[PDB]
Amino acid sequence: AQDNSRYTHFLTQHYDAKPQGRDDRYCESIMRRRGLTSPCKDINTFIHGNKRSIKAICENKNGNPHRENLRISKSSFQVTTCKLHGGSPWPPCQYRATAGFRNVVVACENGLPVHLDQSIFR
Template sequence: MVMFLKGMGPLLLFFILGLWLVSPLTQENDREKRFLTQHFDHHPTGRDDNYCETIMRERDLTNPCKDMNTFIHADYPKIKAVCEDNAGDPYQDERFRISKSQFQVTNCRHHGGSTRPPCRYRATADSRYIVIACEHGLPVHLEKTITAKKFT
């Protein structure tokens, strides 16, 4: 066994180093995938209560019923571009970016007493600026949406 490990030393070290380098990227990709699951829908089918109830269930956001969720309706590259200077500006601190233009969004708000499925949602379609957190140029968190940017 020791002879086997001795012969595998450089290869084993290379493998462990590779895992160590890839691990943060995997975590970022997981956060980006979660962001996309929770907030990205390029081609909505309607933007009414039925849309909210269907997409919230399809995206597994109903166990328990999520109180409120916002879906952004745009090409992914346009959302991702908010993480860069050409389409986004710093917002409050270095963690957040605000879009330079508005996005079509649908807010799905839970209504009803129980937090257990079946969940009932009310839809509000709007056009709003998005405030997102970015890590290494990738959107990972939707902080909020706002109707008007305040310039000071």
């Protein structure tokens, strides 16, 4: 049996299929829902759309090798980046939302994404 717990954690931390708003209040709510507010994560990006396209980044179908053992997608994704504001690392956590549309960088293991590289959204 593979341990793919890091894939399901990747989905919890970085996937939201059908977001609606994607405004500041969206970020503040989802960061709480996904357990990312104790302490407040400084930056966190959610990918939207269908799961199969994200998994496909791990193969030639939708990805290329990138830098040191990462992969970069060939398709663009709707994304929302939530950036903490206020000086406290502890809740309540206020966030500013920035919607975007571009390719994403992940790490893959067992053909599944297990890490999002946040650096491209900083």
